[model samples]
Target: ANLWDYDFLQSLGRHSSVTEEHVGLAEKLKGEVKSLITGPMEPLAKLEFIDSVRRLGLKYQFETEMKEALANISKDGYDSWWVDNLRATALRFRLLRENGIFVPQDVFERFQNKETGKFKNELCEDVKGLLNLYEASFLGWEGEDILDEARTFSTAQLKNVEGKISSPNLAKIVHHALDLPLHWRAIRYEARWFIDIYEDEEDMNPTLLKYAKLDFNIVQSFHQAEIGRLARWWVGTGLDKLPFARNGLIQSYMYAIGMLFEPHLGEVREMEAKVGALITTIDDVYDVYGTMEELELFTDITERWDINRVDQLPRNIRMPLLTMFNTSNDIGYWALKERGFNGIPYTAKVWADQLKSYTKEAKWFHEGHKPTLEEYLENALVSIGFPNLLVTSYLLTVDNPTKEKLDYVDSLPLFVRASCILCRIINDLGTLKSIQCYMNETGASQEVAREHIEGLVRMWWKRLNKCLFEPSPFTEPFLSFTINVVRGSHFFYQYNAESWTKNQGMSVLIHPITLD
Candidate 1:
């Protein structure tokens, strides 16, 4: 009854080994790339190289170097750096904003025709300039009208220029960016795609290319092994035996990778995958299979976190609950062992909150209650499952886990809430709940409601972007999990979970890059 082949998943094993020779070559190349970043190069050149390194998935190794270069650039001031160059200026703005450095929206003001108040039409012919502006526009915040105009203007120009571009490689890049701005894409997927495209570029760095290929293969090997481990764990959980649930093993693991693709994060990736799969199973239970009474009982059991209550749950419900209990306690046990802090209380609380919200939505469905778009989303935010995942993630990711950080995350701060809303709206767009509710409450047409929901997606992204640049109680890595989860939502939900069946982009994780 399940969509995925559990037997095939369990059959997956690590196919390649990373060797000492590979490590030695990678380190040697890494040193060469570091000098390139820190060497005497023009600011724009350094920014371009940094962007390339990031797209090649080698940013983790060169973080310090990139940070220092960016610091020097920002310190020297950018207004004079790029002068009137749209490509360099926009690229600088995007990279700085991405790194949590605040560059104002007015940086683009110089490019606007002072009288006409639009991006200069001449820049449209500059394909690279338009592409950078188009990608950079996505980082705009709540009231950034210039960015709004930039998006509209750049998009129209790029579409018009599509077939006319002189260079085929440049044309391909334009089409790809228009398909989805780089900012909204998951990093791992982008890296896999961009590496091949980058190989064809005239400006490609041979050292960086080899390093990216070897490192990607090595990281792919690490991911294969981790998924192999998760496959075994999943078989042990027996959730697949449930008739109503989605096995979701591979897609769930992809979500984990999307959230944090670093090879060193293998443990977090594995645990996050388990959490993701369990979420699918539980969400299916509430959204489809279980009766109201059974769901309520399961919610109660989750709140109590009591294995004793499992006997009262149905055979289908029993396995999921037992598995969740074991997985949660295992996370808690690790936290205690590693940091001497018992995280069960925090983890259990988030799960309780999640189930309560799920029950609310379930009740709304059963009662035919059409809440206002606002009201539906208030509960949907928690019900979407990031709060639970983020809280548990903090336990595993943050060093020396303290009560304060746990409490901060559990409270559901703005970043967390923004991430959830972004996730919820994108997901609801696919599922049509947001559209239905808005149409119901406003007596608007489905088209109008969808337009309104799309607007909310932009608004939430702006808010999330604001949060990324602001100070917070969380570490950058932890906060990035919130952002990456939203990015994952964008990837998985963009076309309504087709990856679940077709395994879109699955080859990146499974097949190794040939290194000969």
Candidate 2:
């Protein structure tokens, strides 16, 4: 649970630079950006328009119009210049693949010299195109080795070119692309930073700039309200009144927002934040305070999976059981009411498995036995909790997710498994103290275990990154949020693992929902 401080946010007030004049300008620009999309424009200009709005994080606002324009670009086919203009083809491939249109990787072959397998060295001189290619190369699906080769070739070139970047604006863009590509960035976070950069650029439309700033502040307002609402629900439950548990409401909401930032996802976001809060509370009880006898009884109650026995459980244990059952079933009720599907079993089943995993850890802690690395990992994968959480996310977002896909998601499929594994390792790396005692008899210190765990994190990311574009039964939106979940795990734990909940940086991102 997060101990969030909302003090600094009080100072961020509404947009300082925005005024009536600029607000009017944004309305005109919004229509003109539309003209760029809907009006008759060249394929290159049209593609650039779509790409810029997306990079500026305004893509969500223009989804319908953008999609219509993209369809036109794909229909007109690759222009004559696309064969030699690396940026044109690269942007085209990235956009198409991102939209689920399967454009083959072979278009890149035209950029390569026939004599050698390598991309032409002369092409690297077009640093802008190579950067576009660098960004596009990440969209590779399964077995697309050329994209991998392109990534290797372009990444090597970009490092050399980043310093020599002449244009002030292009240099900033290049620096960011080098740090994190357009594909991998979290969109909400990207928007916050991009707004500042776009403002200073000479070519920036005054109207678009005003609109973006105004929209972000408004979104931040909604985020704050949701956080407050979640905090009240969390506090009202009296779960934090229990000792040795985290009051991590702010942290959980941050993760939920990371998973889904659209303003309309209030209910879904609330559910996710509740899930995160409840999980953290129960985790602390199991990981820190729960004893063997109580854990056994608790895990039994979970496995029994019935609501009627609530009174038969202990007072402290009663809340966990009732909360999980009520919250999860309520989520199911909405699905069945709206989509005519019963999704409760999937949710309950995951908790049952998770409880079993937590039970094993409790048993290990009490018995004073250290598990093998493989042994710990196998149990910790489920214990880390992404599989179960993502399952709930899939149901919440999809209208009526297929039983087949839900079954696959329920099972430890490649994408799900790799993500779970990565989260677990990242967790261990951050929460090393818990694992230090579980370490091998060789007596490895936190430093060595961290290095080893960090290495595994890198390897697992490659595995997960490779699968992101590969074929999968999970819908694009489902997979998108799932990826964000994995990305958020790294972000939260990426820095000060010890004082993760200490800073108010997250709470300051928007309005503070709960201060007391």
Q: Report, for every candidate in turn, its global Cα lDDT versus the true structure.
A: 0.83, 0.71
What TM-score would you give candidate 1 relative to the actual structure?
Answer: 0.95
lDDT of 2 at 336: 75
Once fitted onto the true fold, the runs of candidate 2 whose alpha carbons sit more than 4 angstroms away are 1-3, 6-32, 110-126, 241-247, 306-322, 336-342, 361-378, 400-408, 412-415, 425-476, 493-508, 511-516
Candidate 1: which stretches are off by over 4 Å? Answer: 1-4, 11-17, 77-81, 496-505
Evaluate model 2: give its TM-score: 0.78
* TM-score, one value per model: 0.95, 0.78
Number of the predicted model whose TM-score against the real structure is largest:
1
Residue 368's lDDT in candidate 1? 83
Which residue pairs show collisions in model 1?
none
What is the per-residue lDDT of model 1 for residues 305-345, given as tens digits with 9 covering 90 to 100? Answer: 87676787788887887888888888788789877889888
With a 3 Å backbone cut-off (N, CA, C), the pairs that clash in candidate 2 are: 1-247, 1-248, 2-247, 2-248, 2-249, 26-207, 228-513
